Coordinates of all heavy atoms in Angstrom, one line a residue:
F1 N 14.4 6.9 -4.6 CA 15.1 8.1 -4.3 C 16.6 7.8 -4.3 O 17.4 8.7 -4.9 CB 14.7 8.7 -3.0 CG 13.3 9.3 -3.0 CD1 12.2 8.5 -2.4 CD2 13.1 10.5 -3.6 CE1 11.0 9.1 -2.5 CE2 11.9 11.2 -3.7 CZ 10.8 10.4 -3.2
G2 N 17.1 6.7 -3.7 CA 18.5 6.5 -3.6 C 19.2 5.9 -4.8 O 20.3 6.2 -5.2
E3 N 18.5 5.1 -5.6 CA 19.0 4.3 -6.7 C 18.3 4.6 -8.1 O 18.7 4.0 -9.1 CB 18.8 2.7 -6.4 CG 19.3 2.4 -5.0 CD 20.5 1.3 -5.1 OE1 20.3 0.2 -5.6 OE2 21.6 1.7 -4.6
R4 N 17.5 5.4 -8.0 CA 16.7 5.9 -9.2 C 16.1 4.7 -10.0 O 15.7 4.8 -11.1 CB 17.7 6.4 -10.3 CG 17.6 8.1 -10.3 CD 17.9 8.7 -9.2 NE 19.2 8.4 -8.6 CZ 19.9 9.2 -7.7 NH1 19.4 10.3 -7.4 NH2 21.1 8.9 -7.4
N5 N 15.6 3.6 -9.1 CA 14.9 2.4 -9.7 C 13.4 2.5 -9.4 O 13.0 2.2 -8.4 CB 15.5 1.3 -8.8 CG 15.5 0.1 -9.6 OD1 14.7 -0.2 -10.6 ND2 16.5 -0.8 -9.5
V6 N 12.8 3.0 -10.4 CA 11.3 3.1 -10.4 C 10.7 1.8 -10.6 O 9.7 1.5 -10.0 CB 10.9 4.3 -11.4 CG1 9.3 4.5 -11.2 CG2 11.6 5.5 -11.2
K7 N 11.3 1.0 -11.5 CA 10.8 -0.4 -11.7 C 10.8 -1.3 -10.5 O 9.7 -1.7 -10.0 CB 11.6 -1.0 -12.8 CG 11.0 -2.3 -13.4 CD 12.0 -3.1 -14.4 CE 12.8 -4.1 -13.4 NZ 12.0 -5.3 -13.2
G8 N 12.0 -1.1 -9.8 CA 12.1 -1.8 -8.5 C 11.2 -1.3 -7.5 O 10.7 -2.1 -6.6
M9 N 11.0 0.0 -7.4 CA 10.0 0.5 -6.4 C 8.6 -0.1 -6.7 O 7.9 -0.3 -5.7 CB 9.9 2.2 -6.8 CG 9.0 2.8 -5.8 SD 8.5 4.5 -6.4 CE 7.0 4.0 -7.3
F10 N 8.2 -0.1 -8.0 CA 6.9 -0.8 -8.3 C 6.8 -2.3 -7.8 O 5.8 -2.8 -7.3 CB 6.5 -0.8 -9.7 CG 6.1 0.6 -10.1 CD1 6.4 1.0 -11.4 CD2 5.4 1.4 -9.3 CE1 6.1 2.3 -11.9 CE2 5.0 2.7 -9.9 CZ 5.2 3.2 -11.2
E11 N 8.0 -2.9 -7.9 CA 8.1 -4.4 -7.4 C 7.7 -4.7 -6.1 O 7.0 -5.6 -5.7 CB 9.6 -4.9 -7.6 CG 9.7 -5.8 -9.0 CD 10.8 -5.3 -9.8 OE1 12.0 -5.6 -9.4 OE2 10.7 -4.6 -10.7
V12 N 8.3 -3.8 -5.1 CA 8.1 -3.8 -3.7 C 6.7 -3.3 -3.1 O 6.1 -4.0 -2.2 CB 9.2 -3.1 -2.8 CG1 10.6 -3.6 -3.3 CG2 9.0 -1.7 -3.0
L13 N 6.1 -2.5 -3.9 CA 5.0 -1.8 -3.4 C 3.6 -2.5 -3.8 O 2.6 -2.6 -3.0 CB 4.8 -0.3 -3.9 CG 5.1 0.8 -3.0 CD1 5.7 0.5 -1.7 CD2 5.9 1.9 -3.7
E14 N 3.6 -3.1 -5.0 CA 2.5 -3.8 -5.6 C 2.0 -4.9 -4.7 O 0.7 -4.8 -4.4 CB 2.9 -4.2 -6.9 CG 1.7 -5.0 -7.7 CD 1.5 -4.7 -9.2 OE1 2.6 -4.8 -9.9 OE2 0.5 -4.2 -9.5
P15 N 2.9 -5.8 -4.3 CA 2.5 -6.8 -3.3 C 1.7 -6.3 -2.0 O 0.8 -6.9 -1.5 CB 3.8 -7.5 -2.9 CG 4.5 -7.3 -4.1 CD 4.2 -5.9 -4.6
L16 N 2.3 -5.1 -1.5 CA 1.7 -4.7 -0.3 C 0.2 -4.1 -0.5 O -0.7 -4.3 0.3 CB 2.7 -3.6 0.2 CG 4.2 -3.8 0.3 CD1 4.8 -2.6 1.0 CD2 4.4 -5.0 1.2
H17 N 0.1 -3.4 -1.6 CA -1.3 -3.0 -2.1 C -2.2 -4.2 -2.3 O -3.4 -4.1 -2.2 CB -1.2 -2.1 -3.3 CG -0.6 -0.9 -2.9 ND1 -1.3 0.2 -2.3 CD2 0.5 -0.1 -3.4 CE1 -0.7 1.3 -2.1 NE2 0.5 1.2 -2.7
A18 N -1.6 -5.4 -2.8 CA -2.4 -6.6 -3.1 C -3.0 -7.1 -1.8 O -4.2 -7.6 -1.7 CB -1.5 -7.5 -3.8
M19 N -2.1 -7.2 -0.8 CA -2.5 -7.6 0.5 C -3.7 -6.8 1.1 O -4.7 -7.4 1.7 CB -1.3 -7.6 1.5 CG -1.6 -8.0 2.9 SD -1.4 -9.8 3.2 CE -0.6 -9.9 4.8
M20 N -3.6 -5.5 1.0 CA -4.6 -4.7 1.4 C -6.0 -4.9 0.7 O -7.2 -4.8 1.2 CB -4.5 -3.2 1.2 CG -3.1 -2.8 1.9 SD -3.1 -2.8 3.6 CE -4.4 -1.7 4.0
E21 N -5.9 -5.5 -0.5 CA -7.0 -5.7 -1.4 C -7.9 -6.9 -1.0 O -9.1 -6.8 -1.0 CB -6.6 -5.9 -2.8 CG -7.7 -6.0 -3.8 CD -7.2 -6.7 -5.1 OE1 -6.1 -6.8 -5.5 OE2 -8.2 -7.3 -5.8
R22 N -7.3 -7.9 -0.4 CA -8.0 -9.2 0.2 C -8.6 -8.7 1.3 O -9.6 -9.4 2.0 CB -7.1 -10.3 0.4 CG -5.7 -10.0 0.9 CD -5.5 -10.8 2.1 NE -5.9 -10.3 3.4 CZ -5.6 -10.9 4.6 NH1 -4.9 -12.1 4.6 NH2 -5.8 -10.0 5.7
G23 N -8.2 -7.6 2.2 CA -8.9 -7.1 3.2 C -8.6 -7.7 4.6 O -7.9 -8.7 4.8
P24 N -8.9 -6.9 5.7 CA -8.5 -7.2 7.1 C -9.2 -8.4 7.6 O -10.3 -8.7 7.3 CB -8.9 -5.8 7.8 CG -10.0 -5.3 7.0 CD -9.7 -5.6 5.7
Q25 N -8.3 -9.2 8.3 CA -8.7 -10.4 8.9 C -8.7 -10.5 10.4 O -9.2 -11.5 11.1 CB -8.2 -11.7 8.2 CG -8.6 -11.9 6.8 CD -7.9 -13.1 6.1 OE1 -7.0 -13.8 6.8 NE2 -8.1 -13.3 4.9
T26 N -7.9 -9.6 11.0 CA -7.7 -9.4 12.3 C -8.1 -8.1 12.9 O -8.3 -7.2 12.2 CB -6.4 -9.7 12.8 OG1 -5.5 -8.6 12.5 CG2 -5.7 -10.9 12.0
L27 N -8.2 -7.9 14.2 CA -8.5 -6.6 14.8 C -7.4 -5.6 14.5 O -7.8 -4.5 14.2 CB -8.7 -6.7 16.3 CG -10.1 -6.9 16.8 CD1 -11.0 -7.5 15.9 CD2 -10.1 -7.6 18.1
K28 N -6.1 -6.1 14.5 CA -5.0 -5.2 14.2 C -4.9 -4.8 12.7 O -4.3 -3.7 12.5 CB -3.8 -5.8 14.7 CG -3.4 -5.8 16.1 CD -2.2 -6.3 16.4 CE -1.7 -6.3 17.9 NZ -2.5 -7.3 18.6
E29 N -5.3 -5.5 11.9 CA -5.4 -5.4 10.5 C -6.6 -4.3 10.2 O -6.5 -3.5 9.3 CB -5.5 -6.6 9.6 CG -4.3 -7.6 9.8 CD -4.5 -8.9 9.0 OE1 -5.6 -9.1 8.4 OE2 -3.4 -9.4 8.8
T30 N -7.7 -4.6 10.9 CA -8.9 -3.7 10.8 C -8.6 -2.2 11.3 O -9.0 -1.3 10.5 CB -10.0 -4.2 11.7 OG1 -10.4 -5.6 11.2 CG2 -11.2 -3.3 11.6
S31 N -7.9 -2.1 12.4 CA -7.5 -0.8 12.9 C -6.6 0.1 11.9 O -6.8 1.1 11.7 CB -7.1 -0.8 14.4 OG -5.8 -1.4 14.4
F32 N -5.5 -0.7 11.5 CA -4.6 -0.2 10.7 C -5.4 0.3 9.3 O -5.0 1.4 8.9 CB -3.6 -1.3 10.2 CG -2.5 -0.7 9.3 CD1 -1.3 -0.3 9.7 CD2 -2.6 -0.9 7.9 CE1 -0.3 0.1 9.0 CE2 -1.6 -0.4 7.1 CZ -0.4 0.0 7.6
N33 N -6.3 -0.5 8.8 CA -7.0 -0.3 7.6 C -7.8 1.1 7.8 O -8.0 2.0 7.1 CB -7.9 -1.2 7.3 CG -8.4 -1.3 5.8 OD1 -9.7 -1.5 5.6 ND2 -7.6 -0.9 5.0
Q34 N -8.5 1.2 9.1 CA -9.4 2.4 9.5 C -8.4 3.7 9.5 O -9.1 4.6 9.1 CB -10.1 2.2 10.8 CG -11.1 0.9 10.8 CD -11.5 0.5 12.1 OE1 -10.7 0.6 13.1 NE2 -12.6 -0.1 12.4
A35 N -7.2 3.5 9.9 CA -6.4 4.7 10.0 C -5.7 5.1 8.7 O -5.6 6.3 8.5 CB -5.5 4.5 11.2
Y36 N -5.2 4.1 8.1 CA -4.3 4.4 6.9 C -4.8 4.0 5.6 O -4.1 4.2 4.6 CB -2.9 3.8 7.3 CG -2.3 4.2 8.5 CD1 -1.9 3.2 9.5 CD2 -2.0 5.6 8.8 CE1 -1.4 3.5 10.7 CE2 -1.6 5.9 10.1 CZ -1.2 4.9 11.0 OH -0.8 5.3 12.3
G37 N -5.9 3.3 5.6 CA -6.5 2.7 4.4 C -6.7 3.7 3.3 O -6.4 3.4 2.1
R38 N -7.3 4.8 3.5 CA -7.7 5.8 2.4 C -6.4 6.4 1.8 O -6.4 6.5 0.7 CB -8.6 6.9 3.1 CG -9.1 7.8 2.0 CD -9.8 9.1 2.7 NE -10.8 9.7 1.8 CZ -11.6 10.7 2.1 NH1 -11.5 11.3 3.3 NH2 -12.4 11.2 1.2
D39 N -5.3 6.7 2.7 CA -4.1 7.4 2.4 C -3.4 6.5 1.4 O -2.8 6.9 0.4 CB -3.4 7.8 3.5 CG -3.9 9.1 4.1 OD1 -4.9 9.8 3.7 OD2 -3.3 9.4 5.2
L40 N -3.4 5.2 1.8 CA -2.6 4.2 0.9 C -3.2 3.9 -0.5 O -2.6 3.9 -1.5 CB -2.4 2.9 1.6 CG -1.6 3.0 2.9 CD1 -1.6 1.6 3.7 CD2 -0.1 3.3 2.6
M41 N -4.5 3.9 -0.4 CA -5.3 3.8 -1.7 C -5.2 4.9 -2.6 O -5.2 4.6 -3.9 CB -6.9 3.4 -1.3 CG -7.3 2.1 -1.8 SD -9.0 2.0 -1.9 CE -9.4 2.1 -0.1
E42 N -5.2 6.1 -2.1 CA -5.0 7.3 -2.8 C -3.6 7.4 -3.4 O -3.4 7.7 -4.5 CB -5.2 8.5 -1.9 CG -5.6 9.9 -2.7 CD -6.0 10.9 -1.7 OE1 -5.0 11.6 -1.3 OE2 -7.2 11.1 -1.3
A43 N -2.6 7.0 -2.6 CA -1.2 7.0 -3.1 C -1.1 6.0 -4.3 O -0.4 6.2 -5.2 CB -0.3 6.6 -2.0
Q44 N -1.6 4.8 -4.1 CA -1.7 3.7 -5.3 C -2.4 4.4 -6.6 O -1.8 4.3 -7.6 CB -2.6 2.6 -4.9 CG -2.5 1.6 -5.9 CD -3.5 0.4 -5.6 OE1 -3.0 -0.8 -5.5 NE2 -4.6 0.7 -5.1
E45 N -3.2 5.2 -6.3 CA -3.9 6.1 -7.5 C -3.0 6.9 -8.1 O -3.0 7.1 -9.4 CB -5.2 6.7 -7.0 CG -6.3 5.7 -6.5 CD -7.7 6.2 -7.0 OE1 -7.8 7.3 -7.6 OE2 -8.6 5.6 -6.7
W46 N -2.2 7.7 -7.4 CA -1.1 8.7 -7.9 C 0.0 7.9 -8.7 O 0.5 8.4 -9.6 CB -0.5 9.5 -6.8 CG -1.5 10.6 -6.3 CD1 -2.2 10.5 -5.2 CD2 -1.9 11.8 -7.1 NE1 -2.9 11.7 -5.1 CE2 -2.8 12.4 -6.2 CE3 -1.5 12.4 -8.3 CZ2 -3.5 13.7 -6.6 CZ3 -2.2 13.5 -8.6 CH2 -3.1 14.1 -7.8
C47 N 0.3 6.7 -8.1 CA 1.2 5.8 -8.9 C 0.6 5.4 -10.2 O 1.2 5.3 -11.2 CB 1.5 4.6 -8.0 SG 2.6 4.8 -6.6

């Protein structure tokens, strides 16, 4: 939005989606996944 950098946008987001892919390993990663997991995966799909 600020810099019109769509390539850079993909650079920062892809790693975070990759982390989700290996899956939750703690209670706090599990609860985050239960709450926000579907929405983030859907957003990745629109990307």
Side-chain angles (χ1 to χ4, degrees):
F1 290 104
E3 314 236 296
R4 256 60 62 154
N5 211 329
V6 187
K7 192 189 93 78
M9 188 202 85
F10 286 146
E11 258 133 78
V12 310
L13 252 19
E14 177 140 58
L16 316 180
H17 284 293
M19 181 85 139
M20 308 292 302
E21 190 202 335
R22 43 128 264 190
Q25 290 179 356
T26 79
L27 260 29
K28 282 187 179 70
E29 298 181 347
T30 297
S31 71
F32 185 93
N33 196 229
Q34 297 167 331
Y36 306 123
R38 189 188 203 176
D39 282 357
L40 294 172
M41 238 194 293
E42 206 177 83
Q44 180 182 238
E45 295 218 0
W46 288 106
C47 286

